[PDB]
Amino acid sequence: EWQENKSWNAHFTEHKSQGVVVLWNENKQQGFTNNLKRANQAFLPASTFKIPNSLIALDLGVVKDEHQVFKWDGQTRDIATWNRDHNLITAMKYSVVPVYQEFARQIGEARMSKMLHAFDYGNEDISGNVDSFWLDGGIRISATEQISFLRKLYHNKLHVSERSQRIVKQAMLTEANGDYIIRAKTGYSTRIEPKIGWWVGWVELDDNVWFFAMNMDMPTSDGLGLRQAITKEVLKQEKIIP
Ligand SMILES: O=C(O)c1cc(-c2ccc3ncccc3c2)cc(-c2ccc3cccnc3c2)c1
């Protein structure tokens, strides 16, 4: 069911990095990782939490649809793309934390906690501030747990409406060409050690889907592009993408 391929460690070592990639072949129901231990270690989800947060916000009507405009609150922040109006699509694309912090406040602790339990999401623990717990609270999730959650989303099996799941999968669209479609979400956790980058999602092919979840040590923001670059090198090595 599970196979360890340490040859992928070369892709981290080449960049003086360390991390884990987890792949799941949906047709064959087989998983692959370079590091079985780290594949099951739990980290803060950081902005990968925007996936469940979007689902919950949509299903509760906090977000009407993917066109609803969340106006900039006029507070200048140091990421220029955040100092502007957003909808669900652009808020996901630019990982707009303050938009999602307001979602969480409107969702509220009780409904957030119940929904994460229904999703079987990570350690399901929202201890901390309702508007920051995915950044510095008690919630934790492993790469294998990310894949379990994403597989449910892909199959519309989460306990929210089909509509909510379709909208979030639309909002996850990251790349598409004639060979594959990637729906995914990045994350960068810095408030609690170890600092890590995330990329989780899946690759749609004509006749299969490959789920992936990676995290890697990320001491500075300078290496954030390696999240996608390393993942894609693994995908290329395994002949999943050209
Ligand atoms: O994971 C990522 O790819 C990433 C993470 C962050 C991010 C995530 C969570 C945080 N939580 C608390 C405080 C600051 C946080 C910052 C920001 C950006 C980002 C987004 C839009 C940009 C547009 C232009 C230039 N650069 C940009 C950088 C990317």
From Swiss-Prot:
How is it modified post-translationally? Carboxylated on the epsilon-amino group of a lysine, with the resulting carbamate functional group serving as a general base. Probably N-carboxylated at Lys-50 at neutral pH in vivo and undergoes complete N-decarboxylation, at pH 4.1, in vitro.
Instruction: Print the keywords alphabetically.
Output: Antibiotic resistance, Hydrolase, Plasmid, Signal
In this protein, the active site sits at: 47
EC? 3.5.2.6
Q: What Pfam families has UniProt attached to this entry? A: Transpeptidase (PF00905)
What is the reaction catalyzed?
A: a beta-lactam + H2O = a substituted beta-amino acid
Q: Which GO terms describe its molecular function?
A: beta-lactamase activity; penicillin binding
Q: What else is known?
A: When OXA-48 is present in clinical isolates of K.pneumoniae, increasing chloride concentration during antibiotic treatment reduces bacterial growth.
Record family assignment: Belongs to the class-D beta-lactamase family.
Residue positions where N6-carboxylysine is found in the record: 50
Induction trigger: Expressed from an upstream promoter, P(out), in an insertion sequence IS1999.
- Role, per record: Class D beta-lactamase which confers resistance to the beta-lactam antibiotics, including amoxicillin, and moderate resistance to cephalosporins and carbapenems such as cephalothin and imipenem; in the DH10B strain of E.coli. Acts via hydrolysis of the beta-lactam ring. Has oxacillin-, cephalothin- and imipenem-hydrolyzing activities.
Binding, a beta-lactam: 47, 50, 95, 227
List the protein's name. Answer: Beta-lactamase OXA-48
For this protein, the activity regulation entry reads:
Inhibited by avibactam, related diazabicyclooctane (DBO) derivatives and by bicyclic boronic acids, via a covalent binding to Ser-47. Inhibited by chloride, bromide and iodide ions. Not inhibited by the beta-lactamase-blocking agents, clavulanic acid or tazobactam.
Q: Which GO terms describe its biological process?
A: antibiotic catabolic process; cell wall organization; response to antibiotic
Q: Which InterPro entries match?
A: Bact_Transpept/Beta-Lactamase, Beta-lactam/transpept-like, Beta-lactam_class-D_AS, PCN-bd_Tpept
Q: Species name for this entry?
A: Klebsiella pneumoniae
Entry's transmembrane regions: none
| Enzyme kind, highest EC tier | hydrolase
